[PDB]
From Swiss-Prot, chains A, B:
<dbReference type="InterPro" id="IPR038550">
    <property type="entry name" value="GPCR_3_9-Cys_sf"/>
</dbReference>
<feature type="disulfide bond">
    <location>
        <begin position="360"/>
        <end position="367"/>
    </location>
</feature>
<keyword id="KW-0812">Transmembrane</keyword>
<feature type="glycosylation site" description="N-linked (GlcNAc...) asparagine">
    <location>
        <position position="362"/>
    </location>
</feature>
<feature type="disulfide bond">
    <location>
        <begin position="475"/>
        <end position="487"/>
    </location>
</feature>
<dbReference type="GO" id="GO:0099170">
    <property type="term" value="P:postsynaptic modulation of chemical synaptic transmission"/>
</dbReference>
<dbReference type="InterPro" id="IPR050726">
    <property type="entry name" value="mGluR"/>
</dbReference>
<feature type="binding site">
    <location>
        <position position="105"/>
    </location>
    <ligand>
        <name>L-glutamate</name>
    </ligand>
</feature>
<dbReference type="GO" id="GO:0019233">
    <property type="term" value="P:sensory perception of pain"/>
</dbReference>
<keyword id="KW-0807">Transducer</keyword>
<feature type="disulfide bond">
    <location>
        <begin position="490"/>
        <end position="503"/>
    </location>
</feature>
<keyword id="KW-0732">Signal</keyword>
<feature type="topological domain" description="Extracellular">
    <location>
        <begin position="570"/>
        <end position="580"/>
    </location>
</feature>
<feature type="topological domain" description="Cytoplasmic">
    <location>
        <begin position="680"/>
        <end position="689"/>
    </location>
</feature>
<feature type="binding site">
    <location>
        <position position="176"/>
    </location>
    <ligand>
        <name>L-glutamate</name>
    </ligand>
</feature>
<feature type="disulfide bond">
    <location>
        <begin position="315"/>
        <end position="321"/>
    </location>
</feature>
<keyword id="KW-0297">G-protein coupled receptor</keyword>
Length: 745, 745
């Protein structure tokens, strides 16, 4: 029953959330101080200016009929019956020309359903919902604010500028809530952003108590950023709930939080470093002088003013204030959406003015054609196509024109704010969004002094798979990352290095390839023993002071050290069939010299020759001839590849054996020398015993080389020393030959 | 302007979706045939019976005022103004006592917001929404149907009976849609059920065209079951959309689909084998006789009847039908929710009757206390506490009583239906839900002749991690599954079998343990050569036909075969220090016999004894004495554990060497025999040459055994043969001893 009623030629209706919603069974509680009284006085300020105007409806007078919604749709519908009571019954009164819509989206939707049955146009400030643009249902609705379709974009792009991909969302209940968060999740999918958890709040049948949600947000510590689509009532509670548990996140809030300094009262340190959006606006300078001149004495026409005055100053009319200073800059700051309220009222003023110019061109008063207002004509023809410059706002660009579009909406421009500290707390604009996000990172005061990170999983290891959570799996050094999501093998000899995007570091040693570089050091150590045999053989030759034959055998024994060192022309002489033939001839060369000195010069014939000597020398020549024909292709490498990936064949100047060629060459070389041993075996002479005694050791030495001949990998180097030891053992036979002589010469 | 108006002492208001929603700009389209006219005639049937009653309001007469909603909330609000026009203006008419609520939940919510301002009670059949129970807002609402809080339970338990854990949900838009699916996802979490995808349908700003959703359902083939919370309009479209793309799922639908045979018309094969819920009900037998007697001639009072008649028979009043049979069993079947409609009307009848008994006890007519109905008194005191037996329904248990509860709701009982084929199609009830799911699996006709499965991931392999999707990772046979979600290691010798929940099959061969069982077969093959030495030694002894000393040496040589076979008392004689000492004595025993026969009986003294003989025999006695003191602990096993897990030591009666004990024993045994070899080495006699010649082979044989002594793993068996070959080589020395003799004896 409490209202403001100022009569006039034409009457306007208003709906403001002057009183905050009640706690329990009471309808509505305390007084809304910023989004309440201030917005109410803005409409009363504009009406005064319009009646003072001369080019905007100078003949008619504008009246008002302002009610209060108490931030409830059910309470709003009951009040809104006064705007339709006169028109409902007419056959046997105040006829409202239009309604300045409510603030909350649920209130605007509820009223727009009723007024559309009477063809009464409605413009709603501050109500930004995407579902209010469906003109097939709300065919008499318009607004001066952009929809929420553009607010979801502006926050899905801040979460993409910073690489925040794992987030958690909290939304209110109503129509600003679910519809706001339903649009956000579609804009998150297009940018590969994942949602950890999605909760809801409210007042009925949701079961949070604002503490279950806080715990549910703490169950996913990998998501350090929370996206909020909530009203002003729920934003104060959730911050207070987080203060008790002493939690801390970074808050990304829509315009419901806005840039109010009252939501974070008493719980500042839990909201420090927040990031919030707010519609673009410019303060109306003329309004500030109007508000600051008000006091409970001269402001008789405002009924709710007395309740506002006491609540703001903690006085009463519990200290009972007379000489108390009125509203001034020390305790007052203009609300953000005052410009949108003034613009909405002028929208009715210009739309009605064009009606009067056309329908009654002769007179400036209300002609008889205005006795019955046409709601459909005033909306579809006049209101929806207005265009004028914003009053009280000096030209600031493209935002100085008040105009609707095909859906009867506004322009999607936003700001970006951040909560900081200087112990005093305040906001600071650090960004913008006009179809493109353009913010300033440098000035931001972050929550924990560093840019927060929130991704599902942390980043030479494969990582397979949802586009946010992976598993870092390492793979063995014999597999290379073909792509970032797979490592499958690598090269046999090549040893990949650093990132294994390919197979690098071509390994000269791969079993089949001889890495070498260390056998030379082993050869140097082994060369000392070989030189001793040459040195020992040299001393034996000097003791001679027939003779040429003994020297030739020593050369074959001496050639063993050279053959052992070359075991030659290239780094890997074993490669190629000729190399095996060439190596086999050297072994048979020593045997041939010893075999020739055995019976070649030992006269002719106990119980127990030109043809035999020719046949014996023919085999060596044939072996030498085969080796001679293999002069080319003497180089090569030994094939000893084993399942172990690191198989560098350490040998003198690399490992060169021709793989299976050396195996045949090793057996063939024994056969060439075996002819001399076999010939001497048919003697079962003192010199024969020395040859036989040396022959017995040769058979034993060959047996030891047999495991070495089939043993490789080191083991091949040990087997290599076995071949050298065989030459040294053969040199032992030359020592027996020196024994097979006479002293005192 | 089209309505039914029958005057009376008290008037009731109704709201029915008689006309289906319009296609485009037209308000409402064709005629709803089952949930339309039939439900309308049910209320007109009950009103006729009540006026015929004598114990239920016999003095007053009941009137009706029935309107049509065209399945739209906006159209419903416009019509519902007739019920409040008279009461709104009274200072200077039909006063509706109550309203039989609408069918769709959005319609009921919209009207309940308006009627609560005039204190007009409303009972709504067929409207099942969870948010309508919040009595703080809807304080004048009641229903005869259970809320949707119980429908979500009854389907989250069918998805738990069958192990369907990966599902996809499709929901409508309105209040029956989102609120129905928001309750389901909470009941799915409590049973570890996961949601693949969640889509929405509608008519504005959702952007499906019923084909994007179908494709989105096909992008997750692992989810073969779809859960539907949709109205009757969207259920026909989505089935038609799936028919074009020729897709196929199994459908789990709420009561919006119900058990109608019209949703699946023309697209049966895409809905075959569906599973749907429907409220528990029993057909009203009296109603069937009433409906079947109707025809467009005697049913003057029904305005929409003529449109219904032509649409049902494809006639006109394009063939123009007179002698056409009326409604009968050949083309008619009673709708499910006719019992709930009749019950709601009687709820007003009994509530009003109790008012008349109390307020006007003297007269059966309307006393002056009824000139002003008290809406609050009629609802809170009388209507909400009624209790009576259901008319026209014979006693069928606890469902025969019509009663509300604290919230003004009904009882949560449901049925379970299934779509089958006999080419004709029909439904069949195969289940029930009264606080407990009790269905019958056997009779179900499944979509693809088998029980469908839908889980995120498929089931000796670890499976780690969301409670639906895992990764099956196998682990190597040396690791056992400590739990189902981890395999980390196993036992060294034990070889796990079948499921690796533990480490089983205690491996007797673990490198450190000797598996054996195959060395015996190798010993048998090796025993043949050893027997040849014994056989050869036996022949040498028989040739003798001094002597005792030679036989003792042969016994030491013969003991080598026994020592080799025992290399004895236990399966692994090498274990224990005594075993190494015992084995070493056997090797020194042969050397001692040969050493004693060398110079013990060879007189006293080229250039080159009791004390020396005593000292030489003392070492063998000390070695034998040490071995004798180690009689106990002769058993044991050889330690040859290597990184390869399968390390069964194959040897005669297992591998027994005492690990490092055998290594010391092998070296110690050589030292015991080395004393004899060292003593003979100081001779640089024909027999000395034979001993020296045999001694030379012993040094070479020891060198070969040196790699065998340090070579194991097979290799140990080869090394074992090396020790046996050493005994055979020593037996070769006894052959030289036989050579060191005289023939012709
Ligand atoms: N955007 C809001 C809406 O109701 O649509 C959310 O809460 C605040 C109203 C206001 O600023 O007055 C807006
Ligand atoms: N449960 C429903 C509801 O509107 O709440 C869903 O669609 C069908 C109405 C009917 O059976 O008449 C019901
Ligand atoms: Ca409001
Ligand atoms: Ca809202
Ligand atoms: Ca309806
Ligand atoms: Ca609905």
């Amino acid at each position: 029953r409490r209202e403001i009623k100022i009569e006039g030629d034409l009457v306007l209706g208003g709906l403001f959330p002057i009183n905050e919603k009640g706690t329990g069974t009471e309808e509505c509680g305390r007084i809304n101080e910023d989004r309440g009284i201030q917005r109410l006085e803005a409409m009363l300020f504009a009406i005064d200016e319009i009646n003072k105007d001369n080019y905007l409806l100078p003949g008619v007078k504008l009246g008002v009929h302002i009610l209060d919604t108490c931030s409830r749709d059910t309470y709003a519908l009951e009040q809104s019956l006064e705007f339709v009571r006169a028109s409902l019954t007419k056959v046997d009164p105040l006829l409202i020309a239009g309604v300045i819509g409510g603030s909350y989206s649920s209130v605007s939707i509820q009223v727009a359903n009723l007024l559309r049955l009477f063809q009464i146009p409605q413009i709603s400030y501050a109500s930004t919902s995407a579902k209010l643009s469906d003109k097939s249902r709300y065919d008499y609705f318009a607004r001066t604010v952009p929809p929420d379709f553009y607010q979801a974009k502006a926050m899905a792009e801040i979460l993409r500028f910073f690489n925040w991909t794992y987030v958690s969302t909290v939304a209110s209940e109503g129509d600003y809530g679910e519809t706001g968060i339903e649009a956000f999740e579609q804009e998150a999918r297009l940018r590969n952003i994942c949602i950890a958890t999605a909760e809801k709040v409210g007042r009925s049948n949701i079961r949070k108590s604002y503490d279950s949600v806080i715990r549910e947000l703490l169950q996913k510590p990998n998501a350090r950023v929370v996206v909020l689509f909530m009203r002003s009532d729920d934003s104060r509670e959730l911050i207070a709930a987080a203060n008790r548990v002493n939690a801390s996140f970074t808050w990304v809030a829509s315009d419901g939080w806005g840039a109010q300094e009252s939501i974070v009262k008493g719980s500042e340190h839990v909201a420090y470093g927040a990031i919030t959006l707010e519609l673009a606006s410019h303060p109306v300078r003329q309004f500030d002088r109007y508000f600051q001149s008000l006091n409970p004495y001269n402001n008789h026409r405002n009924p709710w003013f007395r309740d506002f005055w006491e609540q703001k100053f903690q006085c009463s009319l519990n200290h009972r204030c007379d000489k108390h200073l009125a509203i001034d800059s020390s305790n007052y700051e203009q609300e953000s959406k005052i410009m949108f309220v003034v613009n909405a009222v002028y929208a009715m003023a210009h739309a009605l003015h064009k009606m009067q110019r056309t329908l009654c061109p002769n007179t400036t008063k209300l002609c008889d054609a205005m006795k019955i207002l046409d709601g459909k004509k005033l909306y579809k023809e006049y209101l929806l196509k207005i265009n004028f410059t914003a009053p009280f706002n000096p030209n600031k660009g493209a935002d100085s024109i008040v105009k609707f579009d095909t859906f009867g909406d506004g322009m999607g421009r936003y700001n970006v704010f951040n909560l900081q500290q200087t112990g005093k707390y305040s906001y600071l604009k650090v960004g913008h969004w006009a179809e493109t996000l353009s913010l300033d990172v440098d000035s931001i005061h972050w929550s924990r002094n560093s840019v927060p990170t929130s991704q599902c999983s942390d980043p030479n290891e494969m990582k397979n798979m949802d586009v946010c959570c992976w598993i870092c799996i390492p793979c063995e050094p014999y597999e290379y990352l073909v792509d970032e999501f797979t490592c499958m093998d690598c090269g046999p000899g090549q040893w990949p290095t650093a990132d294994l995007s390919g197979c690098y570091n071509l390994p000269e040693d791969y079993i089949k390839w001889e890495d070498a570089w260390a056998i030379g050091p082993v050869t140097i150590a082994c060369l000392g023993f070989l030189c001793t045999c040459i040195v020992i053989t040299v001393f034996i030759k000097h003791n001679n002071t027939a003779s040429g034959r003994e020297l030739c055998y020593i050369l074959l024994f001496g050639v063993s050290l050279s053959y052992c060192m070359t075991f030659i022309a290239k780094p890997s002489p074993v490669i190629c069939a000729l190399r095996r033939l060439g190596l086999g001839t050297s072994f048979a060369i020593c045997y041939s010299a010893l075999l020739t000195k055995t019976n070649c010069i030992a006269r002719i014939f106990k119980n127990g020759s030109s043809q035999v000597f020719i046949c014996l020398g023919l085999i060596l020549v044939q072996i030498v001839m085969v080796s001679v024909w293999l002069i080319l292709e003497t180089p090569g490498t030994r094939r000893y590849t084993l399942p172990e990936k690191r198989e560098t064949v350490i040998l003198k100047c690399n490992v060169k054996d021709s793989s299976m060629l050396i195996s045949l060459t090793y057996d063939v070389v024994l056969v060439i020398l075996c002819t001399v041993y076999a010939f001497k075996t048919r003697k079962c002479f003192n010199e024969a015993k020395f040859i036989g005694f040396t022959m017995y050791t040769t058979c034993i030495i060959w047996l030891a080389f047999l495991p070495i001949f089939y043993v490789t990998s080191t083991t091949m180097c040990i087997s290599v020393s076995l071949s050298g030891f065989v030459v040294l053992g053969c040199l032992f036979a030359p020592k027996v030959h020196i024994v097979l002589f006479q002293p005192q010469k």
